[PDB]
Amino acid sequence: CDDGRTTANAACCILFPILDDIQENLFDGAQCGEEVHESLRLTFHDCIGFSPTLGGGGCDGSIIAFSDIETNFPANAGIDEIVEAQKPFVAKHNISAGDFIQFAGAVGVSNCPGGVRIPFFLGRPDAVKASPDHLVPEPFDSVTSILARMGDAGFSPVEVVWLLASHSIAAADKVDPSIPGTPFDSTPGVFDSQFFIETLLKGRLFPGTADNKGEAQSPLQGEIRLQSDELLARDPRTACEWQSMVNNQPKIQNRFAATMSKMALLGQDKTKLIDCSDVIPTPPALVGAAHLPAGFSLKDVEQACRKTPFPR
Ligand code: HEM
Numbered sequence: 645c646d647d648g649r650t651t652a653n654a655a656c657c658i659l660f661p662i663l664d665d666i667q668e669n670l671f672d673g674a675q676c677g678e679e680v681h682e683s684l685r686l687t688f689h690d691c692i693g694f695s696p697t698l699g700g701g702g703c704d705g706s707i708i709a710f711s712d713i714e715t716n717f718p719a720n721a722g723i724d725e726i727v728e729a730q731k732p733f734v735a736k737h738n739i740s741a742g743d744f745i746q747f748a749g750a751v752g753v754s755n756c757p758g759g760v761r762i763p764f765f766l767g768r769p770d771a772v773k774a775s776p777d778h779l780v781p782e783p784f785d786s787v788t789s790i791l792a793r794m795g796d797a798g799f800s801p802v803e804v805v806w807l808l809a810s811h812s813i814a815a816a817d818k819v820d821p822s823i824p825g826t827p828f829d830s831t832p833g834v835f836d837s838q839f840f841i842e843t844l845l846k847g848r849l850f851p852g853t854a855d856n857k858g859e860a861q862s863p864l865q866g867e868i869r870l871q872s873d874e875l876l877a878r879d880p881r882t883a884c885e886w887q888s889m890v891n892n893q894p895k896i897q898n899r900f901a902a903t904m905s906k907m908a909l910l911g912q913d914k915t916k917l918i919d920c921s922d923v924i925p926t927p928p929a930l931v932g933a934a935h936l937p938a939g940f941s942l943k944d945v946e947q948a949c950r951k952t953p954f955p956r
Pocket residue numbers: 678681682684685687688721722781782783784790794804807808810811813814815816817818819858870872
């Protein structure tokens with residue numbers, strides 16, 4: 645390649661001006677802030693719009709291409725601004741929206757401490773059609789409906805748990821509109837196991853207004869809990885996997901990267917793409933060991949796995 649850098653394949657040098665723009669003009673100087681949290685989420689809301697029988701283009705960038713339609717899906721509340729945030733970048737550069745969505749996601753994760761380098765591929769065509777509605781899992785859906793939807797897209801129950809490691813770097817804006825920016829765990833700027841830990845704590849309070857659609861009771865003030873994350877943490881089909889995450893940053897990193905790659909290829913083929921994983925920067929180290937919040941004991945944690953009691 646040219647000024648600065650060089651990578652395994654020549655067509656990957658195009659990503660580097662892109663890499664520079666989004667770190668400064670989208671990620672606030674390569675930080676793990678809100679825009680990073682929304683780009684990661686965006687990859688899912690684009691890709692999960694796929695079903696072998698119901699339709700959808702998958703990771704086709706349709707959520708940007710047909711933002712008028714898809715950003716007004718009820719399940720896409722609050723996505724319309726990461727779309728408009730990424731649009732000027734899609735406009736100036738010559739990669740497809742499908743490619744850019746995944747790149748911004750991958751690059752963004754590597755800005756977060758404890759993060760991982762997700763494999764990124766280049767060459768997706770432009771979006772042909774808008775995704776059908778009702779393909780995006782809602783936080784008030786049952787475990788069965790979530791697992792069936794993710795399963796219909798080709799994800800096993802354990803894979804769903806793995807992909808939900810994303811909630812370690814996450815916050816909600818539309819669940820409780822009164823308290824926007826309330827994170828899913830106590831360490832939203834760090835990619836750790838604190839999400840799986842605090843989810844297993846018992847419900848104690850509502851951080852904002854009284855229960856509204858998709859919200860379960862939170863353990864901590866300044867933290868919000870989705871109704872879907874609470875159930876998945878306790879459901880026999882996934883409880884043991886959810887608890888196994890509270891243990892293992894290596895596994896968390898390992899599994900989050902292997903499945904995101906699988907997700908990013910939904911309806912896209914292999915050989916038509918080229919590999920530019922070389923481009924993704926390397927995340928900083930983990931900033932502290934796992935722990936229960938102050939004032940909490942191992943009793944405060946709910947047990948949902950019958951095989952192995954919650955590991956101290
Ligand atoms: C499987 C069922 C899932 C459900 C029901 C769900 C639900 C939600 C909801 C309701 C929000 C907050 C929306 C708002 O800001 O108002 C959220 C945030 C987020 N989700 Fe999920 N999600 C799921 C899976 C995933 C997956 C597979 C990923 C993969 C990357 C992911 C990544 C994220 C991220 C990064 C955020 C933070 C958004 C922000 O900070 O604004 N989620 N999720």
